[PDB]
Amino acid sequence: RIPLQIVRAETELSAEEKAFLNAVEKGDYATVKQALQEAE
Amino acid sequence: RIPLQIVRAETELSAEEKAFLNAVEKGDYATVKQALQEAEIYYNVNINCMDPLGRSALLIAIENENLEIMELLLNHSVYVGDALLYAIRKEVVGAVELLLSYQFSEFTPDITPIMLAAHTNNYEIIKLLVQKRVTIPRPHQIRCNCVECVSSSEVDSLRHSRSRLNIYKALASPSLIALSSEDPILTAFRLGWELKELSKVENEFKAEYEELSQQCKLFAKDLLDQARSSRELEIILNHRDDLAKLKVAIKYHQKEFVAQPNCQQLLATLWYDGFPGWRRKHWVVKLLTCMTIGFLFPMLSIAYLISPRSNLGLFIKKPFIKFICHTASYLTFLFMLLLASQDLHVQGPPPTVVEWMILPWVLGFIWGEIKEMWDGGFTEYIHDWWNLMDFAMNSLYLATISLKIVAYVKYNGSRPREEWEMWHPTLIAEALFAISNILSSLRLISLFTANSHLGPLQISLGRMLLDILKFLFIYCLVLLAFANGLNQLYFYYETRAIDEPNNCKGIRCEKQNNAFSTLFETLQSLFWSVFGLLNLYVTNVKARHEFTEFVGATMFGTYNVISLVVLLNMLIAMMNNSYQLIADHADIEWKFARTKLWMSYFDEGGTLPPPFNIISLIQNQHYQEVIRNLVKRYVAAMIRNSKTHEGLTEENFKELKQDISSFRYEVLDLL
Ligand SMILES: CC(C)CCC[C@@H](C)[C@H]1CC[C@H]2[C@@H]3CC=C4C[C@@H](OC(=O)CCC(=O)O)CC[C@]4(C)[C@H]3CC[C@]12C
Ligand SMILES: [Ca+2]
Ligand SMILES: [Zn+2]
């Protein structure tokens, strides 16, 4: 068997942070604006 | 009339059930949810049922990327099996993530999600699958003979071969090498070599292993292409576990990696070490500098012999100067061989002044060949394919020397050559010397590689000689056959040499005779018939056997028609077809061959041309950083190129149609 991993590891995103980028991808202006004013 | 029916009948769907699947197809969330909550109560609609075209509701939602109906069906606990693989092949990251978070199949049973992701070559999905600890089983050896492999071959050879092919297609994924690999370049090199070997072994599955090897080579080439500075280039080329990775690439025959423009530029600026501005010079001054260095090879050689630490001693250690010195020494050797042909009745004479000069270059050539043998080894020596004729030259020179010494010791007198023996040692020695002269003078074909306008031409000759070798078998079979027939007819009328007008027998006489009397002479005659040097009256006998004459003449005519009209034009057509297949990659192959010739001069061994040759974790860490930047750049570049190529099918149109229809039922519901 060959083990598989990430030999060049990077910094993963959190759940709310992935949700923010996914909201940017689908174009929900209300969710993106709400996330921005909540992050501020 | 032909009746039509369904010979392989299946289970039809009911009206409400077809309505449910049609509502799934148009994306009416309200209707689908209402049907689900009604089925939970009444048990009238089967949620896991099939369609006329092979799919179920979850499959339709996955292929239509409608994540909200897909998660509704997941929350209602529909059948799940192989829908994960369907989302993997569909390349929908939301479907993949949701099915990871939780009969008939068009996939083989060996298909694992990591393997199907590696087939799809989608970096995102492969990385999300690699985030979980997931394993691919190791393929065995190419020629493994263990009990498990022989049992799997005997039980079901189709599934065994499909499984091995499936494993190797999974492993040859550029994304799966970009991740999960300590050294992607070396991994691609070894994988390409292994896929080439499996292509050679598995005859039936040849093209797919060839294209996988080509894909690995292209991945390595593009990974080298993504470099953006000369330091990163030299860290890649100088990594070892100089130019260690370049030598590995040459060993694994990665012509695409070797023929990279940046690698060729670095090799060029190592090759022109002494001259920094050879790239921008005129033809006349280049020729003048080349002749100026070439006329000073003994001065540079004796400078190296006397004092290596000087302006002239280390001047020959530069690669271009070393190449010019070797070429000039070898050309002077050929000039002396030409001079050697310019009393002749002495039996076993002493060597003349020209042969006394030739002898140290002969010794130096033999010493250089055996030194290359002892230094490089065995496989590297036999792999070159020029060392075969080099060995032939050395053997013929040694035989000439031995026969000359034997003749000089055994014979003393001065007898004219008209009454010498036919197997005289002097005659044998001179024949061998002339053959070695021809071999020495055609050894110069190897120097066409270093030239810009002759290298691809030499590559084209080396690729069409294979088809000439293929044609030679058929031609020699025809030659042997017609020689046998003509012998069987004509060997009754063999005449002695005395009966001839000038006591000459054979096709090399003024009047050609006995062309088909013996098998050797028949082979010679039917060989010389190709070039027209065999006259027509060699098919004649002294007796009046006109039928015998006519059958012999039509045998000769049939041989001429088969050879000159059919076979020769076949050879012309074959090489013309073969040349077009080589003209595309001739540049890459020439650059690879010229790189090999350049690296042959980078070593300190073999510096002196004949006859003068007889007289450390920071490297790993820097390499890892450079490869990490290369992998990031390559993934970005192949994502951009995936978003620049055609890539679009009717999947996209039905995706937009699904979005429009789902929205349509949404606003018809809200209003
Ligand atoms: C074939 C006719 C003209 C009779 C002459 C025979 C030889 C005297 C010729 C034939 C092949 C020639 C060679 C063909 C190609 C080259 C490469 C050439 O190098 C380059 O192309 C320069 C650029 C570089 O090396 O980077 C140097 C001369 C040399 C060895 C030539 C030297 C002279 C040779 C041996
Ligand atoms: Ca050699
Ligand atoms: Zn095995």
Curated annotation (Swiss-Prot), chain A:
ANK repeats lie at residues 14-40. It is found in: Cell membrane. Belongs to the transient receptor (TC 1.A.4) family. STrpC subfamily. TRPC5 sub-subfamily. The lineage of its organism: Eukaryota, Metazoa, Chordata, Craniata, Vertebrata. This is Short transient receptor potential channel 5. It comes from Homo sapiens. It is linked to Loss-of-function variants in TRPC5 may be involved in a mental disorder characterized by maladaptive behavior, anxiety, autism, postpartum depression, extreme food-seeking and hoarding behavior, hyperphagia and obesity. Homotetramer. Heterotetramer with TRPC1 and/or TRPC4. Each subunit in the homomeric ion channel (via ANK repeats) interacts with one copy of GTP-bound GNAI3; the interaction is direct and activates the ion channel. Interacts with TRPC4AP. Interacts with NHERF1. Interacts with MX1 and RNF24. Interacts (via C-terminus) with CABP1. Interacts with SESTD1 (via the spectrin 1 repeat). Interacts with PLSCR1. Interacts with PKD2L2. It comes from the Eukaryota. The chain holds residues 17 to 56 of 973 of the full protein. Expressed in brain with higher levels in fetal brain. Found in cerebellum and occipital pole. Forms a receptor-activated non-selective calcium permeant cation channel. Mediates calcium-dependent phosphatidylserine externalization and apoptosis in neurons via its association with PLSCR1. Acts on distinct neuronal populations in the hypothalamus to regulate innate behaviors including feeding, anxiety (flight/fight/fear), socialization, and maternal care.
